[PDB]
Write a protein of this length. Sequence first.
Lengths: 221, 221, 221, 221, 221, 221, 221, 221
Amino acid sequence: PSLSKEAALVHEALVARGLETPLRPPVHEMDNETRKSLIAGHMTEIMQLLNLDLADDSLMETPHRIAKMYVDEIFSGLDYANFPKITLIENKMKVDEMVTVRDITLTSTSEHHFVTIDGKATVAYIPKDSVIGLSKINRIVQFFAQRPQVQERLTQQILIALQTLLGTNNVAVSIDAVHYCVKARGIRDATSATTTTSLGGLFKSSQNTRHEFLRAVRHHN
Amino acid sequence: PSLSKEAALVHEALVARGLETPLRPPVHEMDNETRKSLIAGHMTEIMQLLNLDLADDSLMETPHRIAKMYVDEIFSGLDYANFPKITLIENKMKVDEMVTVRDITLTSTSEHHFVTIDGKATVAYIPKDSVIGLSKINRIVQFFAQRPQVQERLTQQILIALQTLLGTNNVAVSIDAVHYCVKARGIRDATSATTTTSLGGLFKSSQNTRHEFLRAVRHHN
Amino acid sequence: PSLSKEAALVHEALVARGLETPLRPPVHEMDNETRKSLIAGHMTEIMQLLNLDLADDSLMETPHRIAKMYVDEIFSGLDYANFPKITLIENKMKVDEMVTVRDITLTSTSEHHFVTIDGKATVAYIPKDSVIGLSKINRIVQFFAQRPQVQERLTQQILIALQTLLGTNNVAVSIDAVHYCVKARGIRDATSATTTTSLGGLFKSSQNTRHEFLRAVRHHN
Amino acid sequence: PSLSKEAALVHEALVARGLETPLRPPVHEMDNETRKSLIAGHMTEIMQLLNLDLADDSLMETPHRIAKMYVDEIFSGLDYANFPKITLIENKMKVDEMVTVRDITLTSTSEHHFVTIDGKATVAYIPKDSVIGLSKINRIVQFFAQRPQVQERLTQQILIALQTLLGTNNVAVSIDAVHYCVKARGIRDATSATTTTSLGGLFKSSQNTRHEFLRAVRHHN
Amino acid sequence: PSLSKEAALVHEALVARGLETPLRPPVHEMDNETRKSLIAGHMTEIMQLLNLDLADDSLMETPHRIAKMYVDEIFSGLDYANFPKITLIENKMKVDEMVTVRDITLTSTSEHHFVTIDGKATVAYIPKDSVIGLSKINRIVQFFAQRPQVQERLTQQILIALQTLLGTNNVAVSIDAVHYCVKARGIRDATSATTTTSLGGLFKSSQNTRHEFLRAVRHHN
Amino acid sequence: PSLSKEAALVHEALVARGLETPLRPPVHEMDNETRKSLIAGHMTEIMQLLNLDLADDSLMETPHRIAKMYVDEIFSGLDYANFPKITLIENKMKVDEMVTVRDITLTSTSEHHFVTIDGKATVAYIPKDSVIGLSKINRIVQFFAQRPQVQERLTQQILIALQTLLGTNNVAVSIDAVHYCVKARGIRDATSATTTTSLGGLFKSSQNTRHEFLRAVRHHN
Amino acid sequence: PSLSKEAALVHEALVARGLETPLRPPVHEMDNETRKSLIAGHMTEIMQLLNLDLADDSLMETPHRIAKMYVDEIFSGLDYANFPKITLIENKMKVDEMVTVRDITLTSTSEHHFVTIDGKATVAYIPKDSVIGLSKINRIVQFFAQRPQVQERLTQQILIALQTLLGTNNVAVSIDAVHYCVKARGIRDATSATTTTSLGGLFKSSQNTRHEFLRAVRHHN
Amino acid sequence: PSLSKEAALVHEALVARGLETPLRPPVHEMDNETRKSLIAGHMTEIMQLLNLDLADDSLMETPHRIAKMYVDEIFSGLDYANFPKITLIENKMKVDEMVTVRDITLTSTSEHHFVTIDGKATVAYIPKDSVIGLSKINRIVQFFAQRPQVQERLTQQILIALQTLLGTNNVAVSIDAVHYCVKARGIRDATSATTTTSLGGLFKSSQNTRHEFLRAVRHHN
Ligand SMILES: Nc1nc2c(ncn2[C@@H]2O[C@H](COP(=O)(O)OP(=O)(O)OP(=O)(O)O)[C@@H](O)[C@H]2O)c(=O)[nH]1
Ligand SMILES: Nc1nc2c(ncn2[C@@H]2O[C@H](COP(=O)(O)OP(=O)(O)OP(=O)(O)O)[C@@H](O)[C@H]2O)c(=O)[nH]1
Ligand SMILES: Nc1nc2c(ncn2[C@@H]2O[C@H](COP(=O)(O)OP(=O)(O)OP(=O)(O)O)[C@@H](O)[C@H]2O)c(=O)[nH]1
Ligand SMILES: Nc1nc2c(ncn2[C@@H]2O[C@H](COP(=O)(O)OP(=O)(O)OP(=O)(O)O)[C@@H](O)[C@H]2O)c(=O)[nH]1
Ligand SMILES: Nc1nc2c(ncn2[C@@H]2O[C@H](COP(=O)(O)OP(=O)(O)OP(=O)(O)O)[C@@H](O)[C@H]2O)c(=O)[nH]1
Ligand SMILES: Nc1nc2c(ncn2[C@@H]2O[C@H](COP(=O)(O)OP(=O)(O)OP(=O)(O)O)[C@@H](O)[C@H]2O)c(=O)[nH]1
Ligand SMILES: Nc1nc2c(ncn2[C@@H]2O[C@H](COP(=O)(O)OP(=O)(O)OP(=O)(O)O)[C@@H](O)[C@H]2O)c(=O)[nH]1
Ligand SMILES: Nc1nc2c(ncn2[C@@H]2O[C@H](COP(=O)(O)OP(=O)(O)OP(=O)(O)O)[C@@H](O)[C@H]2O)c(=O)[nH]1
């Protein structure tokens, strides 16, 4: 009727663990269209406060572009209606070893300064009853990435979403990323990168499994 | 009394050529403090429109951090009071060959989506009466970079600022950058990068000089 | 009233362990202004003893620049009034795995010859009650780096400062650096680099954790 | 009787062109020993002004080490008594093509902040009557490098020193370097590097020769 | 009165273990000057046996250059009068983790063909009562390197010298090198390299420590 | 009857141009066996002068090994009886473009200190009446390399040897090498390398051809 | 009826230019089967002369494998019945710029020692009336590669075959290769590689075109 | 009287373990000269069967070249009269850690198709009573490599040869190689490589030692 069974499931799971992004229920039944126009209005004000000449052919549409970007693009992960369609195939192949999807492109936004987070994620899991379609892992990652994030939370969320959908605790997520709110300003450290990992099931319990995954993490380009 | 002779000079030069960032004069004598609080207010609204729980310990101060960032950090280049102190040494060494400062760290913001532009600039010039202090070239670049930009304009601005301060038309600026408003969203092209160059004096006239510079452009890390 | 609670805490911790930089209390209430002028005075003398023509437009301001650099820049870490503002977010995400910030830019000065130490630090910790703001790790590193150091001590200082602020002994710091007082003169070894690591809590006790961190240390560029 | 014919020649050549380092004649007949003790005295004062505990076993000898380093090591290039012994072999091989010595290690000090300059020089020349001993090129570069420099002047000096000794104007010098007074502090640009070149004779006249040299410049490691 | 305490100690240690370089006591009180002239005499003979025209301006001084090189340069490690001055600082920092100096430039000569051995050493130790000055490790390595060697012995010597000076058995040395008497002639293997390691104390006893070191060995450039 | 026509031709060509290695005719009809024993005798003396214990199982045969190495191996290039067998095939393929053999392994000895020179040569020529067998270029380079050399002369000798054998002046030779008598001792420059080139015929006349060759010079590994 | 029109054309073209592989007409109407058995017979003999135990399970079938390999595989290019099927599409796209197929895998055999030649070819041409199917270029290269070759001839053959088929003289071929009969034995040069190029039409006439191609040659992996 | 004690020992050891190359005793007392002429005869026939014009100046001597190559070069390993001279030095240095010679050039021939095998071997051993001369390891590898091989057997032979000569079972050999009979033809896999390892003594027993060696295996260039 709105949210898919999966979307609902993942959402509840996150809420239960207290890992959901801080959200207040939709204050009023607003069309994304009205929300965008309102956001655009505020951007117009802010741009004017910065003394930008909004009459300039280029600058003129920026409040619109920004409103659209926030609502439809970069923060679309906040709406579970945008949760990807998950397809799982029966594990007839009897795969009992981990499947690793490495170097998943991940672009997020830091909630602290609303500045770009560019990184790559490495997800691995040991198939139980079903094998998830490869692209879905990338889609789920991008879903949670499209929200004002805190890398530490993002990793946790991805882990739970997967554990929930795959029906196994044997999931591990590692994210390596560069925060422009560290690089582009403030301390302006042009070289540092942050790495966060959340291990589930055997990936935490079994040191054998755990290290196999960790060893596999990080691959240049 | 406010702007240094240099700042004034550069500003006028840009205005004269019509290369200045679209700015409307300070509407009213507002303290950066009041501007920030106003910007913060609008951010609070926008964040609320996105349904973010502003009561969350982390999210709570984001409108403040963003306001400060815009005014004091990332868009500080809009205020010529922030123009760097230029120091020039007499060209007693009789340098008659170009001096090239390569891989200058450059972090800017696209004016179209207010999203990160990460790149590197290569500046070169042929000393006439004076030799500019090396760090000043980096400072000037970062100055113009700290504004809502359009790479094509940024390059031009840097070129003119330098030509003005050095007293020679023999200046060349090349900027190679990645736009997150292309990578992180929209067409999401993870590999493309844009390169823009503005050549002045001999760097445009003399094919010999011109190519020497172009050959020198781009160096990994 | 002067030093923040954090600054005070870290300082005391260091003193208690005997890991503080050898300092004599401020002999007399001198303005940094008077200290600088005196330092510059001594530099003038030194430069004269080297037979440098201080009347040269360029050389003329060096004593001033050096005084300023020592007091305000490169040795600012000696004054806890310059300790960074630490911000910690409650560990609601329930992160129980280490967070690693790698390739933190680190530029320090050797106390033995007052010559450049260029390196990179890798800090990792396992969140307990709170998660520290990423940039703060970078800031703290740079703080202790801005002092006449001994790499062996620098590593220890950073370790303790973090353990103190984070409220966990599970912190690990590794610094890889090139000493110009080895490279640029003396034995003039153009290739060697020194690596020092200080491990705390699980990073030292648990060989599993220990090796996970060590394995993660060092990343080119 | 003191300076070698070569040292005298080079010194004069530099003075004639006005390219010598700004030096005041030795004010008084001071032993390097007394100069050092005086320099060490001033360092003791400076360190005390920084509140350093000079009673510390390590810190205790730093003023001595710094005095020795300035006089005997890093600034030894200021004394032509330290000029290298040049050996030239008769060009019987009838070499008429350029000889290029690339990636010559070069460590110098910036005269503006007395901070490290780490770089590499590439020198090339076309043999006329004599061929210089390969290591001598390295020794001459290091000689002029061991002085408070300005890259633009350093390049020039090396060019003239060589033109003088070789008896040909066909000499070219290029230096690519990283200034720690740009990287380690101030604007703290961790990625930029400066490249300066001084071309003599055919290397400037003949575009054919000129480009062959420029093409040959820069080689990683 | 001649050899420093350290030199004497190191020498005795080696002799005791039977790891000293095969040396016969100074047959007669010969000045290095007379030794050099005699060596040069023999070289003159050898060069004449090779039919070289010693009247050639270049060739003429080779016997002198070789004699000086053998006695003063490449084989200077044979005279303990040339042992480096060691400086140790009290381990007040309470460093209990290994300090690793990697990629120490090492150039030696094979005793079998008196041909170049070019390589890099990696030394690591766990501080006990004192911390050695970083450059001293490089100096000790170069000292023993300056002798007609056998890589297997060289590694051993360095290990003992350091254990002796540091007062700890917890020292490890690894040397990776290319032998020109394998590359430049004979089997002419242009790609092979030899790696020898000597482990002491915990580096041998504790597999945990041992592997941490071994893992750390070898770094390109 | 002794020397092949080729050996004789090349030798004469070199002598005519004054590019031969400085050699005195074989003083007396000595067997290489007697020369070797004599050389070994001198090495025994030199080693004794260095206080080496020649009774050591290892050191015991070094004089012999060195004698053999000099006479049979590293300086075998001095005897034209060791000139390679040249094979040329008729240029029926009508090749009128240059053939380039790049990265030819080259190991030589500096005549100034009898120390290793390790480098790589790049030879190219435009076939006229005949095409030389590829390995022969390598063999000729190694021949001349096996002599106490001066890079500048080595390059010239190879050029002439080839022009002579190929019957064309259209030959170009470039050698890039590292001198251990610069690296391993003296100024100890661990990074510099010297490049020398000798161009003949069109490679010197035609800037088109000249630059095509130069462009092709140098290839990593 | 046997050879395709293309095959016949190419063959005749080569014969006309005198660039065909030295072949004597099929002495007698022998089945490849009888030829193979005879070749295998001779190999059996050769292996027995080498004292190999042909009764060994593995060795037993080598003569058969070699015969099949020579006739059917590595020397199949000797039979024009094996010439690839060429497909050309009408140049309706009006392509007037060169099409470059780079890094074409090329494995051939030297006619001098019947040893492996492993390399890569780069072919470029300017479309006139028709555009050739991309894979056809690879197929033609491999065809001529499958014969006992001389790199100088191979390059020529490929050039002509393509000029013939494409109906344009504007074709250029460059082959970079390693000869195991230089590497694996004889002089055993483990690093050298040979590059041969044959330019036709504008690639030879127009220096503009010529250099665009040459610049494009060679790409790692 | 013919074979050295070592050659005899190694040969017997191999035969005893059943690891010798399948050889039939020398059928008749044939001079290598007669074997070569006979081999050449067969090659003449084979070449004629391939329709090659043996009257061609180039092709004319291939039968001879191949015969010489097989007998003297590439298959010389089959004659123990070609076994290298082994020199061992008494392990007075008391080396008790493994010595590893890595990246030993290895060129062999596959016995199945008589096609090139190009690879690199890594040998390591723990000295017992004696230390083998470094080049001897290279020489032994090349010896066994110069035979029609099967990588799996080659590795074993080298292992045994070494264990025998060194008087210890603590030897490990690993070979990584590319088979042109897989690359150049058949399945034509241009990227695969095969790695085979044979471990002896502690390298097999002790997992500690075993993994230290394995970890050390493979180094690019
Ligand atoms: N743990 C964590 N911290 C983050 C993340 N994104 C940003 N931060 C940090 O959260 C903190 C925000 O701190 P504040 O002190 O409130 O803001 P600020 O002073 O403008 O930040 P800085 O100038 O960069 O130190 C900073 O230390 C940020 O770098 C993230 O994903 N995870
Ligand atoms: N042209 C040139 N400039 C140099 C060199 N070394 C340092 N400089 C610059 O010379 C100038 C010194 O400027 P000042 O403004 O007097 O000192 P400063 O303010 O401490 O310098 P910054 O904080 O780095 O901008 C700076 O721009 C230095 O980076 C050099 O070799 N060549
Ligand atoms: N020339 C130029 N274009 C830029 C720069 N920064 C952004 N742009 C582009 O300016 C345009 C904005 O176009 P709009 O069509 O108005 O906005 P948009 O549709 O949201 O943009 P896309 O979804 O990325 O195509 C886009 O094509 C941007 O990628 C810049 O520095 N220079
Ligand atoms: N352990 C340690 N030693 C350092 C550090 N920085 C410098 N050193 C060394 O501390 C020692 C100073 O030794 P001294 O002998 O007192 O001075 P010096 O003789 O001028 O030093 P060298 O000429 O470089 O050997 C040297 O070995 C320095 O390289 C550091 O961070 N840690
Ligand atoms: N273990 C060891 N061997 C070395 C070292 N330097 C040289 N060697 C070897 O010691 C041996 C000398 O052997 P000899 O047979 O006496 O001399 P050689 O025949 O001229 O040597 P090759 O022709 O290279 O095999 C050779 O195997 C050298 O490569 C070293 O540092 N360690
Ligand atoms: N041009 C040239 N010079 C060479 C070559 N090999 C060595 N040399 C140099 O020839 C010169 C010999 O100089 P001397 O001054 O006679 O000997 P030296 O003082 O021991 O040499 P250094 O200590 O290295 O400066 C040195 O500059 C050597 O580095 C070569 O191939 N070509
Ligand atoms: N020009 C050319 N020469 C080749 C080619 N393949 C092999 N050769 C060379 O042709 C020559 C054969 O020379 P020969 O002297 O007849 O045989 P060889 O003595 O066994 O050869 P080497 O021992 O390698 O010098 C050698 O110089 C080979 O390296 C090729 O494609 N082109
Ligand atoms: N294990 C092993 N196999 C090898 C080696 N060299 C070659 N081979 C393989 O031994 C087998 C020979 O197989 P055959 O089927 O008798 O000959 P073939 O059909 O011509 O071989 P392909 O066409 O390459 O599959 C092939 O699979 C070869 O690739 C080696 O060193 N070790």
